[PDB]
Design an enzyme around this catalytic site. Structure first.
Site, PDB file in Angstrom:
ATOM      1  N   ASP A  45      11.183  21.308  36.143  1.00  0.00           N
ATOM      2  CA  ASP A  45      10.427  21.813  35.008  1.00  0.00           C
ATOM      3  C   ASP A  45       9.290  22.770  35.435  1.00  0.00           C
ATOM      4  O   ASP A  45       9.012  23.759  34.746  1.00  0.00           O
ATOM      5  CB  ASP A  45       9.921  20.650  34.146  1.00  0.00           C
ATOM      6  CG  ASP A  45      11.019  20.035  33.285  1.00  0.00           C
ATOM      7  OD1 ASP A  45      12.020  20.727  32.987  1.00  0.00           O
ATOM      8  OD2 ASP A  45      10.961  18.862  32.834  1.00  0.00           O
ATOM      9  N   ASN A 118       4.277  24.509  27.347  1.00  0.00           N
ATOM     10  CA  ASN A 118       3.904  23.089  27.323  1.00  0.00           C
ATOM     11  C   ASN A 118       2.620  22.846  26.526  1.00  0.00           C
ATOM     12  O   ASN A 118       2.623  22.125  25.541  1.00  0.00           O
ATOM     13  CB  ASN A 118       3.674  22.543  28.739  1.00  0.00           C
ATOM     14  CG  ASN A 118       4.921  21.959  29.390  1.00  0.00           C
ATOM     15  OD1 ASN A 118       5.965  21.773  28.763  1.00  0.00           O
ATOM     16  ND2 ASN A 118       4.804  21.667  30.684  1.00  0.00           N
ATOM     17  N   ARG A 144     -17.489  15.277  22.671  1.00  0.00           N
ATOM     18  CA  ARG A 144     -18.077  15.162  23.992  1.00  0.00           C
ATOM     19  C   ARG A 144     -17.182  14.267  24.827  1.00  0.00           C
ATOM     20  O   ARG A 144     -16.811  13.170  24.386  1.00  0.00           O
ATOM     21  CB  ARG A 144     -19.520  14.636  23.965  1.00  0.00           C
ATOM     22  CG  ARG A 144     -20.243  14.829  25.314  1.00  0.00           C
ATOM     23  CD  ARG A 144     -21.696  14.387  25.336  1.00  0.00           C
ATOM     24  NE  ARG A 144     -22.308  14.508  26.662  1.00  0.00           N
ATOM     25  CZ  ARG A 144     -23.515  14.050  26.977  1.00  0.00           C
ATOM     26  NH1 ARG A 144     -24.263  13.437  26.067  1.00  0.00           N
ATOM     27  NH2 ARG A 144     -23.984  14.207  28.209  1.00  0.00           N
ATOM     28  N   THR A 157       6.107  15.759  25.852  1.00  0.00           N
ATOM     29  CA  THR A 157       6.590  14.823  26.872  1.00  0.00           C
ATOM     30  C   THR A 157       5.868  14.977  28.208  1.00  0.00           C
ATOM     31  O   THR A 157       6.119  14.208  29.137  1.00  0.00           O
ATOM     32  CB  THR A 157       8.131  14.952  27.092  1.00  0.00           C
ATOM     33  OG1 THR A 157       8.482  16.323  27.297  1.00  0.00           O
ATOM     34  CG2 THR A 157       8.900  14.588  25.820  1.00  0.00           C
ATOM     35  N   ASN A 160       0.405  15.812  27.196  1.00  0.00           N
ATOM     36  CA  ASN A 160       0.204  15.186  25.901  1.00  0.00           C
ATOM     37  C   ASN A 160       0.622  13.708  25.886  1.00  0.00           C
ATOM     38  O   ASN A 160      -0.062  12.864  25.312  1.00  0.00           O
ATOM     39  CB  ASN A 160       1.023  15.961  24.875  1.00  0.00           C
ATOM     40  CG  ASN A 160       1.061  15.285  23.528  1.00  0.00           C
ATOM     41  OD1 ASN A 160       0.192  15.510  22.692  1.00  0.00           O
ATOM     42  ND2 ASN A 160       2.075  14.448  23.308  1.00  0.00           N
ATOM     43  N   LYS A 161       1.754  13.403  26.522  1.00  0.00           N
ATOM     44  CA  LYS A 161       2.238  12.023  26.578  1.00  0.00           C
ATOM     45  C   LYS A 161       1.281  11.136  27.370  1.00  0.00           C
ATOM     46  O   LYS A 161       0.981  10.015  26.941  1.00  0.00           O
ATOM     47  CB  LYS A 161       3.634  11.964  27.194  1.00  0.00           C
ATOM     48  CG  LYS A 161       4.173  10.547  27.349  1.00  0.00           C
ATOM     49  CD  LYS A 161       5.651  10.538  27.670  1.00  0.00           C
ATOM     50  CE  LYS A 161       6.166   9.102  27.605  1.00  0.00           C
ATOM     51  NZ  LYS A 161       5.673   8.301  28.784  1.00  0.00           N
ATOM     52  N   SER A 162       0.827  11.634  28.530  1.00  0.00           N
ATOM     53  CA  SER A 162      -0.097  10.889  29.397  1.00  0.00           C
ATOM     54  C   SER A 162      -1.434  10.622  28.700  1.00  0.00           C
ATOM     55  O   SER A 162      -2.102   9.641  28.979  1.00  0.00           O
ATOM     56  CB  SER A 162      -0.356  11.644  30.699  1.00  0.00           C
ATOM     57  OG  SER A 162       0.828  11.824  31.412  1.00  0.00           O
ATOM     58  N   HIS A 218       0.885  25.675  33.888  1.00  0.00           N
ATOM     59  CA  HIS A 218       0.482  25.438  35.285  1.00  0.00           C
ATOM     60  C   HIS A 218      -0.642  26.359  35.782  1.00  0.00           C
ATOM     61  O   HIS A 218      -1.135  26.193  36.897  1.00  0.00           O
ATOM     62  CB  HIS A 218       1.699  25.538  36.211  1.00  0.00           C
ATOM     63  CG  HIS A 218       2.426  26.842  36.106  1.00  0.00           C
ATOM     64  ND1 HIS A 218       2.699  27.633  37.201  1.00  0.00           N
ATOM     65  CD2 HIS A 218       2.919  27.504  35.032  1.00  0.00           C
ATOM     66  CE1 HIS A 218       3.330  28.725  36.808  1.00  0.00           C
ATOM     67  NE2 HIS A 218       3.476  28.670  35.496  1.00  0.00           N
TER      68      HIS A 218
END
Ligand SMILES: Nc1ncnc2c1ncn2[C@@H]1OC[C@@H](O)[C@H]1O
Ligand SMILES: Nc1ncnc2c1ncn2[C@@H]1OC[C@@H](O)[C@H]1O
Ligand SMILES: Nc1ncnc2c1ncn2[C@@H]1OC[C@@H](O)[C@H]1O
Ligand SMILES: Nc1ncnc2c1ncn2[C@@H]1OC[C@@H](O)[C@H]1O
Ligand SMILES: Nc1ncnc2c1ncn2[C@@H]1OC[C@@H](O)[C@H]1O
Ligand SMILES: Nc1ncnc2c1ncn2[C@@H]1OC[C@@H](O)[C@H]1O
Ligand SMILES: Nc1ncnc2c1ncn2[C@@H]1OC[C@@H](O)[C@H]1O
Ligand SMILES: Nc1ncnc2c1ncn2[C@@H]1OC[C@@H](O)[C@H]1O
Lengths: 258, 258, 258, 258
Positions: A45, A118, A144, A157, A160-162, A218
């Site tokens: 990816d 992403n 804040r 996935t 955002n997922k983390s 990235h």
């Protein structure tokens, strides 16, 4: 058709790239890395993300394909063993196109705009980090904390997922905002991820510090003298080549469940 | 126009109902609680939910209005002080209609179908509770835990929010699945809320126990000899009367921030 | 020494029980299920929980041992292949004792007290569920939602974990309170799990409804006409036999990581 | 007794400092900012953190006092209006001492050790950030994500809380590890906060990148050529002066509930 192939640059990926180029040589396909109509990315990816950003000025003209030489990817998504099969189909033109939404990021100091496949994130640069979050011109919250993340549907996935965001089918034209470690005591935010439709504009504005780390996928990117960061669903879409049914929810299952 | 008014049944709500009926008497409006064209609910979001379910067989024919006699509601959303103003506008016909998506729930033992404005949940009935989660015919996960919640967009600020789901603008035609205390060790689920578009079908199927508590909004509802629970975005929509701009994100801010 | 052996009751567990009884017959060990000094449980953590509650009136007199005939357990924790080895060690007395904290639950209508090895939970009985949470006599919060969970340290890897609680080394004499789907809008709770030391008393008191589902480990237990539920770390401890080093954090890793 | 007073440096805090110095002049108290026995901090929790680190080489010799000139603090915790009252009590010696646990951080390249009152965090320095987490010499997990936070009990209401950690009564001698946005797909972590007792050692070791941002409370601190970061509960404690009962759980309620 003009095509190009990017490689993650390990032995596996490079050898498969060369084999595919050789395989494309048996058809009416020309290697053009300047104006390709087909961009094949071989690796993960991360490699696909590079490929997207390499060619984001010609997104309307390009169909993307991802081949994973390691474990399954969300963008990269075809097995190396099926690479010979894709050469034929691509050269014969036996494929449809599917489009995913993208995120437009505007940074005002002059303006600079970016496309994310992403997500785009904002952080500091020294702890927190205070920003006013404005939705369609109306002040929503004073945030804040560590930072904020705005994600596309296919990006849900990833980061955002983390951060606790919802996974969103990429047929939905939307963007999702998540918080990174917000203080709640002054000092109040919604907590929940927020999902915005097309034409909604979310704006981030500085309170004291004007120097942020701004990421797009990235890439990142310390921004100096920033007045505003603006988010909305892009009018532009990334186009993938397909081929066969590999449903989003299967990819989710295959990546996270079993 | 035929109208009716439901009241939460406290002194405040009843008196305002009577005042509105009296106010409607000065125009060409007739009180009909059998086939109303306008349903006014006076109280809170709970009262509005009753009103919706009272009249769900005639949703295409009805425009709904919510008046909060306590704190601000997401459906109920007009101040009592503005009730005199709405009498006039309603009777003069100076209003548009906005529609929110609904959730269709199908329960197969024979089939029974339900419409949810907020959400439908499945629980047991004795601890956990094991169900196979199937998305568009493909097995996605075996869930073990307290239960599952499937929410509409306007329902995302209710139960869905408490379970960690994303808040979703109700212009998005989607449904959101959240988990209640899932075991992760056998035994693996996605964790993240999942957001599905129209035409996606999520099915829940029993593994051992066939007796579930199934909720639809405020109603629940122990179901015996269940083979399957099916979720999808309904083809039907609830219609609200408006009137003035009161944006979803303002209601979110006003309810949860300040 | 007097010993007994409980079995989960499958073929595997029953046969191993019989083999162990036979093995114990070669030493000076007598099978006594009324006043054992050693309680061996064969199956899973669920079976061990039954064993604990079978013998909670004689906890100071008993050393417990868990054998898993399926996957690794937190209490059950020895392999079937090592069962012959434990027969000898137990009969020769070549073992120390380790103690874990327990949770005392007091329910006032008259009072009834219970010991939990994992946790005690309070729920309704019909949706939410409103309770006043009082810590050492001072009102802390009004909770509205699905329920509350009070966990021991060894219980933190069970229900508490699924609710977002911290995993706590069982050498710490403490209890941990977690929330199940709390409403935050009236209506405010802390959100975070709370960890209390010995001698702290947490009390739950009803606001309207007095009929709760109260669980203690695997037992539950609809309580009628309840005035108060009181939690504190018990003065009593469960004693395990050991044997060999199998550190808590290794068990956590082995159960949840790899 | 030797005392000193730090101020946040606004008009309010400075004037109150001068008034307290004047008030201390009426007793047998001498202003010594080199070797004080009493350290009074006037401002917020941030100011108190500075005071602690100003004087961490003499922690066994010092009793700390916090006065909030803004909203209530967890360390700073006395009202300005009660400042005249504390002058007398302090000068008359009518006060006990309470001690909170501290966190020892060891950084090996040579070693450098630090004491944290709130927490120590590790981050990069460029996205993630991969570290091996080793607990008492046994490899526990490979963490990939934004960073990790190790908190004392009194620090649990700060950064630890924003990351989802449990709030821990500061009479418990423990430390708590929380994750910041961990990737779970390679790539698996526990998710849950972990609570360790005294004498447990948690070690973080680099996988590729050796350059980390390491924070201790408000200080940070890019560390170059790092081999290991070690955490354990310190043998040293911070001592507060008291005075009156202001229970931790009341401070939690007063700060986060109402
Ligand atoms: N859309 C996506 N969904 C899930 N994972 C993704 C992703 N994009 C990149 N990654 C993963 O993020 C860390 C890298 O390992 C890469 O595979
Ligand atoms: N802490 C984190 N957790 C998950 N994904 C992350 C991450 N940091 C960066 N990424 C992903 O790596 C590629 C980016 O697009 C982003 O999604
Ligand atoms: N869509 C919604 N959004 C937020 N809160 C809602 C809601 N529907 C009902 N409630 C609230 O749920 C508990 C009741 O107090 C009611 O006001
Ligand atoms: N634990 C909880 N948290 C938040 N909302 C809840 C809840 N239980 C029921 N509801 C809401 O009350 C009206 C229903 O529609 C549901 O959304
Ligand atoms: N202390 C504990 N830690 C982790 N899991 C536990 C546990 N007690 C019971 N279980 C598991 O809870 C569901 C059952 O499968 C049982 O193994
Ligand atoms: N939803 C859930 N998630 C995890 N564990 C659960 C659970 N419900 C019950 N248990 C565990 O099963 C044995 C009990 O002690 C409790 O810990
Ligand atoms: N132990 C603690 N608990 C809660 N908040 C704390 C804290 N230490 C500092 N802060 C707050 O962190 C951000 C600053 O506003 C400061 O008040
Ligand atoms: N994102 C965040 N959320 C909450 N507290 C934070 C924070 N970043 C730093 N701090 C606190 O500020 C003082 C430090 O000790 C730390 O606890």
């Amino acid at each position: 058709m003009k095509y190009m192939i990017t490689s993650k640059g390990d032995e596996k990926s490079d050898l498969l790239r060369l084999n595919m180029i050789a395989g494309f040589g048996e058809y009416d396909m020309e290697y053009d890395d300047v104006e390709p109509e087909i961009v094949i990315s071989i690796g993960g990816d991360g490699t696909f993300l590079s490929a997207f950003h390499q060619y984001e000025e010609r997104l309307d003209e390009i169909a993307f394909i991802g081949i994973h030489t390691g474990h399954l990817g969300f963008y990269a998504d075809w097995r190396p063993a099926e690479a010979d099969k894709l050469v034929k189909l691509l050269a014969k033109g036996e494929y449809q196109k599917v489009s995913y939404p993208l995120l437009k990021t505007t940074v005002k100091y002059k303006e600079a705009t970016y496309l994310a496949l992403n997500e785009s994130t904002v952080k500091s640069s020294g702890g927190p980090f205070v920003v006013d979050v404005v939705i369609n011109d109306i002040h929503f919250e004073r945030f804040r904390g560590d930072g904020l993340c705005m994600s596309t549907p296919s990006g849900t996935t990833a980061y955002n997922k983390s951060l606790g965001g919802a996974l969103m089918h990429p047929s939905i034209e939307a963007m999702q905002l998540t918080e990174m470690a917000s203080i709640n005591n002054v000092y109040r935010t919604i907590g929940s991820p927020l999902v915005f439709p097309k034409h909604h504009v979310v704006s981030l504005q500085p309170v004291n510090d004007k120097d942020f780390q701004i990421s797009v996928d990235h890439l990142s990117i310390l921004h100096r003298d920033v007045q505003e960061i603006r988010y909305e669903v892009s009018a532009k879409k990334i186009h993938f080549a397909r081929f066969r049914s590999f449903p989003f929810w299967r990819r989710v299952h295959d990546s996270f469940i079993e």
